[PDB]
Enzyme design. Structure first.
Site, PDB file in Angstrom:
ATOM      1  N   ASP A 177       0.823  -1.215   0.000  1.00 47.62           N
ATOM      2  CA  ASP A 177       0.000   0.000   0.000  1.00 47.62           C
ATOM      3  C   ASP A 177       0.858   1.267   0.000  1.00 47.62           C
ATOM      4  OD1 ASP A 177      -2.548  -1.326   0.020  1.00 47.62           O
ATOM      5  OD2 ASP A 177      -3.165  -0.476   1.925  1.00 47.62           O
TER       6      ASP A 177
ATOM      7  N   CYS B 251      -2.497   0.665 -13.569  1.00 45.82           N
ATOM      8  CA  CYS B 251      -2.529   0.688 -12.121  1.00 45.82           C
ATOM      9  C   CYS B 251      -3.660   1.630 -11.735  1.00 45.82           C
ATOM     10  CB  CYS B 251      -1.162   1.075 -11.558  1.00 45.82           C
ATOM     11  SG  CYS B 251      -0.342   2.542 -12.351  1.00 45.82           S
TER      12      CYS B 251
ATOM     13  N   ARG C  80       3.432   2.575 -10.998  1.00 46.14           N
ATOM     14  CA  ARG C  80       3.708   1.139 -11.173  1.00 46.14           C
ATOM     15  C   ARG C  80       3.720   0.744 -12.648  1.00 46.14           C
ATOM     16  NH1 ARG C  80      -0.457  -0.949  -6.376  1.00 46.14           N
ATOM     17  NH2 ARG C  80       0.243   0.615  -4.842  1.00 46.14           N
ATOM     18  N   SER C  81       2.771   1.261 -13.435  1.00 48.68           N
ATOM     19  CA  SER C  81       2.727   0.916 -14.868  1.00 48.68           C
ATOM     20  C   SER C  81       4.005   1.344 -15.583  1.00 48.68           C
ATOM     21  CB  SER C  81       1.519   1.585 -15.530  1.00 48.68           C
ATOM     22  OG  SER C  81       0.267   1.032 -15.112  1.00 48.68           O
TER      23      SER C  81
ATOM     24  N   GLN D 114       6.547   7.856 -10.551  1.00 44.96           N
ATOM     25  CA  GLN D 114       5.907   8.922  -9.768  1.00 44.96           C
ATOM     26  C   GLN D 114       6.722   9.415  -8.578  1.00 44.96           C
ATOM     27  OE1 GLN D 114       2.056   6.708  -9.255  1.00 44.96           O
ATOM     28  NE2 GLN D 114       1.176   8.749  -9.474  1.00 44.96           N
TER      29      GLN D 114
END
Ligand SMILES: Oc1ccc(CNCc2cccs2)cc1
Length: 283
Positions: A181, A215, A221-222, A262
């Site tokens: 998370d 994502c 994440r992508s 990110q």
């Protein structure tokens, strides 16, 4: 510089935030005028994440062709990817329309439906064989065929039917279920194992349309997934694998979608994944 020793040099000097901010400063800025039209407000999950006009995927519809999705075309590596946000309640039909129209074989999902107590995307695939889904706005039917649950990821076989023509296709759903998370994984081993499973399925290969990867926003994440895949492929293709410059590859990918990677922690994790992956590929 090479990668593994550039890596130790940034760790010892603690300069990951400065490296990452340089990337943010140098990244391309292209218009995203279609994404910002008022009629498309409920088609975007986040107001600050939009596809560029020049690389956006168009739906084959004359009313409204807009979806928050971008084509990342890597010329030297000879790989293409579609990066998209997690589907919203009012875009699940658009999502499967895109999969159909672009001839994709595989869908890669890097988030859970609920994280941090909030919904990160719609439940857009069926959870029981006998309870199929119909998307009336785009005239598609989706059926769960089989499901294989492993410790770090789940693979599903799905049948997508175009109800207008009665044509059917098999779609593979690759669901990475264990990204934490907060933060990034401590080791890249399970992420790399997952990437290799997607590869082995044929979903990334030129005989199919581009893989669809998402994502929640479709940039963090992508971005890590396609950056690691392309860098490892280039290391196999070139005479000198130490010439592969992960920062240059990332800036090339950011010509096609804004914001890929990110955080500085995601940047460090991408280096770690490529470094460990390059040892398994050989020796
Ligand atoms: O139904 C929905 C209602 C709002 C949103 C979020 N929209 C974000 C924004 C995009 C552009 C300006 S504001 C999504 C779905």
């Amino acid at each position: 510089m090479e990668m593994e020793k550039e890596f130790e040099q940034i760790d010892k000097s603690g300069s990951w935030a400065a490296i990452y901010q340089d990337i943010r400063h140098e990244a391309s800025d292209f218009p995203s005028r279609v994404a910002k039209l008022p009629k498309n407000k409920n088609r975007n999950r986040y107001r600050d994440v939009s596809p560029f006009d020049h690389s956006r995927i168009k739906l084959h519809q004359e009313d409204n062709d807009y979806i928050n999705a971008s084509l990342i075309k890597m010329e030297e590596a000879q790989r293409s990817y579609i990066l998209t946000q997690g589907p919203l309640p009012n875009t699940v039909g658009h999502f499967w329309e895109m999969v159909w129209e672009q001839k994709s074989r595989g869908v890669v999902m890097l988030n859970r439906v609920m994280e941090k107590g909030s919904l990160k995307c719609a439940q857009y695939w069926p959870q029981k064989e006998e309870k199929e889904m119909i998307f009336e706005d785009t005239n598609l039917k989706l059926t769960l065929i089989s499901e294989d649950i492993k410790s770090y990821y789940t693979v599903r076989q799905l049948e997508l039917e175009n109800l207008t023509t009665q044509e059917t296709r098999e779609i593979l759903h690759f669901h990475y279920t264990t990204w934490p998370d907060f933060g990034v994984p401590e080791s890249p081993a399970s992420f790399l194992n997952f990437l290799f499973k997607v590869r082995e399925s044929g979903s990334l290969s030129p005989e199919h349309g581009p893989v669809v990867v998402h994502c929640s926003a479709g940039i963090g994440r992508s971005g890590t997934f396609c950056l690691a895949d392309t860098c490892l492929l280039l290391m196999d293709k070139r005479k000198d694998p130490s010439s592969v410059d992960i920062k240059k590859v990332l800036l090339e990918m950011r010509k096609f979608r804004m914001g890929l990677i990110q955080t500085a922690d995601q940047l460090r994790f991408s280096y770690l994944a490529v470094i460990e992956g390059a040892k398994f590929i050989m020796g």
